[PDB]
Amino acid sequence: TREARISRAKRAFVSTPSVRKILSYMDRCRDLSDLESEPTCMMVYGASGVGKTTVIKKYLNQAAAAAAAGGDIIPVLHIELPDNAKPVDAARELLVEMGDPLALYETDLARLTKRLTELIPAVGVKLIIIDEFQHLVEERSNRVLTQVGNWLKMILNKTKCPIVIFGMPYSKVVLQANSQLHGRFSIQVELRPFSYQGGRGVFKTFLEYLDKALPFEKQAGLANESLQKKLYAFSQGNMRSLRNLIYQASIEAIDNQHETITEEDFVFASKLTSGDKPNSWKNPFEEGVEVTEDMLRPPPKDIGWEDYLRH
Amino acid sequence: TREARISRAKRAFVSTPSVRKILSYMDRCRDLSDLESEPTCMMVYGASGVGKTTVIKKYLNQAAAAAAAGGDIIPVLHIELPDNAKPVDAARELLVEMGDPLALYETDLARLTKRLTELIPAVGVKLIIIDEFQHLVEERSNRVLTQVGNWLKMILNKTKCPIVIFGMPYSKVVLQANSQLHGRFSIQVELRPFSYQGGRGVFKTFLEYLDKALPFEKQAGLANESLQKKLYAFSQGNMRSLRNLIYQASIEAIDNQHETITEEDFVFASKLTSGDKPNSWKNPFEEGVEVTEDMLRPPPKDIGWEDYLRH
Ligand SMILES: Nc1ncnc2c1ncn2[C@@H]1O[C@H](COP(=O)(O)OP(=O)(O)OP(=O)(O)O)[C@@H](O)[C@H]1O
Ligand SMILES: Nc1ncnc2c1ncn2[C@@H]1O[C@H](COP(=O)(O)OP(=O)(O)OP(=O)(O)O)[C@@H](O)[C@H]1O
Incomplete structure (x- = not known):
């Protein structure tokens, strides 16, 4: 096996x-x-499985590794809101993640606000990274509960520390809910999936460097005429479903001692990780799926909105 | 009788x-x-009666027998959380199990956290094995109380010692509750029951070696065409109900001096240990239960989830 590989x-x-x-x-x-x-307060949008968490983890490592190794400093944070979050819930989660208080027995929202304003300049917090901002949308109704948003404005104005709130694109309406919180988050970037198949785009050089990064020694066959078309046909832009297929195909080629990733175990990996894919979607790998013009259109504008459009 | 046998x-x-x-x-x-x-921190899932406690007991013996015989060292532990556990409750249970403090009179959660961090490198703890992780799910509501999970993250980061938390599959949502605790427990294995009857599978060789291990001298008749089909029909994959039936049949064949386990006392053992079995299930042993295709399907995906799905 070689679990290292x-x-x-x-x-x-x-x-x-x-x-x-x-x-x-x-x-x-x-x-x-x-x-x-x-x-400054940036907002970063991005659909289901674009690589937001990987961005935050890459930043966390490249920023805070040596400083966390030095001592209890924790310059940058990583916060994942709970679902249907109250200000006290997200406040105490921010508290128990940051350093080591107790902070999750005495829930009175005001004294723990005073605690984390006492503690944020104490340890030396430089940045707050919030991962889930679509949790402030209620599930079945379309009201966006503005208690956590107003509390974020409160903690932003009380202790001046930059907050980079990540979330899905339909979390924009939560920022549209509060005009003050809208005015605060000026810098808005859209981390959207891969765009086109035509070749010599960002997708080809991405698969070229991923082909380099794979643990096989000689080639993996990615980013050529045939396989790139089949790869985009399987996974439109979704980074996670692409990486899952490549991961399952890689460990399949490692299991039965092979040269590289070939068109032997890739078909098996396609039939393995095609459970989540929609009803009208076709697997381009099976027996005779001539990859069409209609399969290789760029991802839509409302790619990460559909759950909000479902109700 | 011969209680040795x-x-x-x-x-x-x-x-x-x-x-x-x-x-x-x-x-x-x-x-x-x-x-x-x-x-490293492994998580091992597994349904109701797969043989988790037998795995921990086998590991305990093969690891810590000679080292516990040498002196008060206790390299590996075995912890069974109480139901609706608080951090102080599971903390003091971890304490009173590990070595010999008093530890269960003075409940202040902070000084006993200091005590077990003082004591874990003192005695030389190499591993902590927690058996029940589904206790952190509240009974009638579906909130998972994250105080013990955050304390486990605390004790993990404070004293770097590997924790192998066992539990039922619907305890996964408790690991989904805390994103930091989710990130920590990377290695996740599913100890799921036996799969198919078709023959020449893991179930046949398992019953072959268990046929060897039984205290009868000549044969026990297991893992043949007829009896293996009847055995899987009785107990789908549930190791405990299979072993119970075999145990009751064995001690029935021992009681009235017999050659081996035959189709005389096996029927009696089937009617004995068929109390727990569900409403629509049929006993394949009684008079004329032609064992069907529909009986011998593999166990479902959500085999150990049903108590979570019940509410
Ligand atoms: N630049 C990259 N190169 C290779 N793989 C990547 C890259 N960025 C992300 N991935 C992979 O994409 C997958 C997506 O995981 P991740 O949790 O980061 O996605 P996400 O968009 O945050 O998902 P969600 O919106 O559900 O939180 C991971 O398996 C990760 O390894
Ligand atoms: N490999 C094995 N060979 C024979 N018998 C086994 C094996 N593994 C488990 N058993 C038997 O299965 C039964 C189940 O016991 P055990 O408590 O280990 O299961 P469990 O899944 O941990 O149950 P619980 O979750 O209720 O504690 C025991 O009677 C044990 O002897």
Whole structure:
């Protein structure tokens, strides 16, 4: 097996220009705040499985690794809101994640607000990264509960620290709900999936560097005329479904001792990770799926909105 | 009677490839942690009566028998959380199980956290095995109380010692509740029941080696065309109900001096241990139960989820 080779196939990061744009803006957002004046506050949108969490994890490592190794400093944070979050819930989650208080027994919302305003300049917080902002949309109705948004405005104005709220694109209406919180988050970037198949685009050079990063020694066959068309036909832009197929195909080619990823175990990997794919979607790998013009259209505008459009 | 023979029938371990996978990963999880850097932290799921407690007991014996015989060292632990556990409750249970403090009079959660962090490197703890993780799911509501989970993250980061949390499959949502605790427990294995009857599978060789291990001298008749079909028809994959039937049949054949386990006392053992079995299930042993295609389907995906799906 060589689980070292398996973890090498699973932990493969390839920097796209969109990711490097987000990382440059994140480094900018941090280094601009003097923690006296009002911070910059970026909002980053992005659909289901574009690589937002990977961006936050890549930033976390490249920023706070040596500083966390130095001592209890924790310069940048990573917060994942709970579903249908109250200000007290997201406040105490922010508290128990940041350093080591108790903070989750005494829930009175005011004294724990005083605690984390006492503690944020104490440890030396430079940035707050919130991952889930679509949780403030109620599930079945379309009201967006503005208690956490107003509390975020409160904690932003009380202790001047830059907040980079990540979320799905239909979380925009939560920022549209509060006009003050809308005015605060000026910088808005859209981390949207891969665009076209025609070749010599960002998708080809991405698959070229991922072909380089795969643990096979000689070639993996990606980013050629035939296989790139079949790859985009399987996974439109969704980074996660593409990486899942490549991961399942890689570990399949590792299991039965092979040369590289070939058109032997890729078909098996396609039939394996085609459970989530929609009703009218066709698997381009099986017996005789002539990959069409209609399969290779760019992803729509409302790609990460559909759950909001469903009600 | 010969209670020696009875204890021989009761204590019968047969290693499956799934159990050897869990034991190899457990030995790996222990021997990788240097107790300076962040440990590996495996999660092992498994339904109601797959043989989790037998795996922990087999590991406990094969690991810590000679070291516990040497002196007060206790390298590996075995912890069974109480129901609706608070951090102080599971903390003091961990304390009073590990070595010999008093530890269960002074409940202040902070000084006993300090006590067990003082004591874990003192005695030389190498591994912590937690058996019940589904207790952190509240009974009638579907909130999963995250105080014990956050305390487990706390004790993991404070003293770097590998924790192998066992539990039922619907305990997964407790690991989904805390994103940091989710990120920590990377290695996740599913100890699921036996799959098919068709023959020449893991079930046949399992019953072959269990036929060997039984205290009868000549044969027990298991893992043949007829009896294997009747055996899977009685107990789908549930190791405990299979082993109970075999145990009751064995001690029935021991009571009235017999040659082996025959189709005389097996019918009596079937009617004896068929109380727990569901409403629509049929006993394949009684008078004329022609064992059908519909009886021998593999166990479902959500085999250990049903109590979570009930509310
Ligand atoms: N630049 C990259 N190179 C290679 N793989 C990548 C890259 N970016 C992301 N991935 C992969 O994409 C997958 C998507 O996981 P991730 O959780 O980051 O997505 P996400 O968009 O945050 O999902 P969600 O919206 O559900 O939170 C991961 O398996 C990750 O390894
Ligand atoms: N490999 C094996 N060979 C023979 N018998 C086994 C094997 N594994 C488990 N058993 C038997 O299966 C039964 C189940 O016991 P055990 O408590 O280990 O299951 P469990 O899934 O942990 O149950 P619970 O979750 O209720 O604690 C025991 O009687 C044990 O002897």
